[PDB]
Point group: C3
């Protein structure tokens, strides 16, 4: 039970972010065991452990560049990029394992760019690999 933690979220075409935080949100929740993925955007770790994270953020409008940072408690840990102005729906993708303690916050930030065209079909997933 308490060792079972996972979330998976997708950006659809729903039409329900700030220049400060620039948090990328995912409206369609596919998995949320434990309900620790909150506000369509932020994962809050329930316990100390190793967690897997992966994401694909779609650069839809072709002539733009984006940079996406995976954030841990307000600080960047990994980065992804998409800036091929010949390509439509190019993914800025990366993944990582992290050592998290209880109440650690992990989310995606649009560090650079504007996601012109929207970011439909973008994905963001995470799960507890094992507790420590």
């Amino acid at each position: 039970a308490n060792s079972k933690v996972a979330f998976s979220a997708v950006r659809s075409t729903n039409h329900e972010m700030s220049n400060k935080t620039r948090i990328i949100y995912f409206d369609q929740i596919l998995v949320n065991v434990g309900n620790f993925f909150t506000l369509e955007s932020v994962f809050v770790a329930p316990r100390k452990g190793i967690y897997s994270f992966s994401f694909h953020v779609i650069k839809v409008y072709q002539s733009q560049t984006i940079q996406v940072n995976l954030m841990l408690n307000g600080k960047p840990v990994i980065s992804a990029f998409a800036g091929d102005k010949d390509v439509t729906r190019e993914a800025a993708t990366n993944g990582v394992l992290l050592y998290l303690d209880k109440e650690d916050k992990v989310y995606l930030k649009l560090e650079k760019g504007n996601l012109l065209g929207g970011w439909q079909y973008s994905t963001f997933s995470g799960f507890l690999v094992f507790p420590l």
Copy 2:
């Protein structure tokens, strides 16, 4: 019981799609690296043995030039996530994505070539997945 489940497959040649695959549009992988539980069948379809959360990932590599491709991860005949590879005039291009799904027993997960033809083959393409935890 059936708590260890995982598969992993790769397209090892540049051979063209089979005549059957042109009518189902289901992308298949001939080289099976992992198939614990033997739940990955027909070199293409994963059948969930039990209720739980399952991870999936895929990298479909197209050559130049098959037309712009769209790959959907399918769950019981309906698309869940999609990836795109529009040509950037290079020798090879990749349509990639991954996701966690809540699956029930006998649920079927597979890859569909929604758009495009994969002319020139899809060598080096990969498709993987595993049970994260039963539910």
Copy 3:
């Protein structure tokens, strides 16, 4: 060792070592996770026990003029490949991922099969974990 995982990042834009140029092994300086310490300082993973392991990588470059091919290697042999390059963009990633059956002491690592890492490979990642022992 039921709990085995590593995750590593290339944190700088520094050129590869002369040794690295010789071995073609892509190395990572920043280790975020290394439970069991089976990911060595030479950026090679040594499987502690028989089991199914997950591996993912992203090799990111700022200079993409020439083609790069990255192979995931298992005891000196390629298992999967990733391609990038021959482009002029901000940053591009050669990426792929796979599950592998490993026997104990099997060696898994990234080799630059084609191309170079002129300009550095900052922000590149390489991760792996034991899904379950067999």
